[PDB]
Design a protein around this ligand. Sequence first.
Ligand SMILES: Nc1ncnc2c1ncn2[C@@H]1O[C@H](COP(=O)(O)OP(=O)(O)O)[C@@H](O)[C@H]1O
Ligand SMILES: CC(=O)N1CCc2c([nH]c3ccc(C)cc23)[C@H]1c1cccc(O)c1
Ligand SMILES: [Cl-]
Ligand SMILES: [Mg+2]
Length: 335
Amino acid sequence: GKNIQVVVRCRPFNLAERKASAHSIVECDPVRKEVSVRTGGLADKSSRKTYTFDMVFGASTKQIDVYRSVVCPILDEVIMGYNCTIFAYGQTGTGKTFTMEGERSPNEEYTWEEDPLAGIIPRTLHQIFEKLTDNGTEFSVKVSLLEIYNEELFDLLNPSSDVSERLQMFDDPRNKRGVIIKGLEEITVHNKDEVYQILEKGAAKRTTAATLMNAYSSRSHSVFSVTIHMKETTIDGEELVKIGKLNLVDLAGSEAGNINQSLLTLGRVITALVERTPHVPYRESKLTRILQDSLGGRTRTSIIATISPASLNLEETLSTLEYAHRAKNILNKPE
Ligand SMILES: Nc1ncnc2c1ncn2[C@@H]1O[C@H](COP(=O)(O)OP(=O)(O)O)[C@@H](O)[C@H]1O
Ligand SMILES: CC(=O)N1CCc2c([nH]c3ccc(C)cc23)[C@H]1c1cccc(O)c1
Ligand SMILES: [Cl-]
Ligand SMILES: [Mg+2]
């Protein structure tokens, strides 16, 4: 930090947790930026474990709130010509995809641009077009989507590809730090009225990979990349040619050895960047080598650690909070 930002988003109870008679064990204090977990296991009030983060979003935080607090500062950075990454990390069913992608409201009540349930990806794409159209920047938007599953790469935006084809990755000559994902489809989003059809297809090919290859999004990393080419011109001012890049990663469930290793490697990359340790283990997983260029800096990185509020998931919630705390060691302040 302030470059690496680690924030926590707790979701509301789900129906499963109600029917299991789960109890609320998480308290989220946005002002003090703390999350407290009752380790109540025969002990009360005994065992409240407190963690402090850059931000904390209670179960009632709306999609727009997450965008404003987390994405806006990062997108301004992207538009300035820099290369950023936002992660969603946590146990399956705590809201990684809800945060990253969102959902449509019931319906057909909103346009996709006004839908309160829309997540980071569609909101970012809409804002890129709003901001850059509004100030008259000459720009082009292109997007790729790949899923890392079982240490294999899959292109989710290739129309004629097939779900079963794996992509190859090489190191970039002209850029140590970079890689080339041969044949990765980079679709051009010509206007904000193209984005929705594009996202639909990507989600459709995601569904096909799961049905056939048993490639469950639960156990795969989703990397949605958006690259913006910007020429900005002012008479008696400045002529700026910039290229911004934003990666929006929806990680595999934090709860098969290639997932543990890749997520733990990611944790070590982050900590090393925060700690400013000379050694950062990019090479050690495909996820972190793919994202190496968007990580060291000068870059904004944000991790949204997602948690459930229910006692039913105490172990995985503490696991998630430990992970997040390992990544960026923020200290508890006095109450
Ligand atoms: N912050 C939140 N607010 C409201 N509902 C949420 C939130 N986070 C997750 N959900 C709901 O939880 C369910 C599963 O979330 P999902 O996006 O699949 O999480 P994950 O990506 O970790 O599996 C969905 O029905 C989603 O609508
Ligand atoms: C069916 C559905 O929920 N959607 C359709 C496709 C989709 C949504 N977000 C996404 C983020 C990444 C990818 C690869 C697909 C989608 C999502 C959505 C897009 C735009 C506004 C919204 O409120 C919701
Ligand atoms: Cl501490
Ligand atoms: Mg998911």
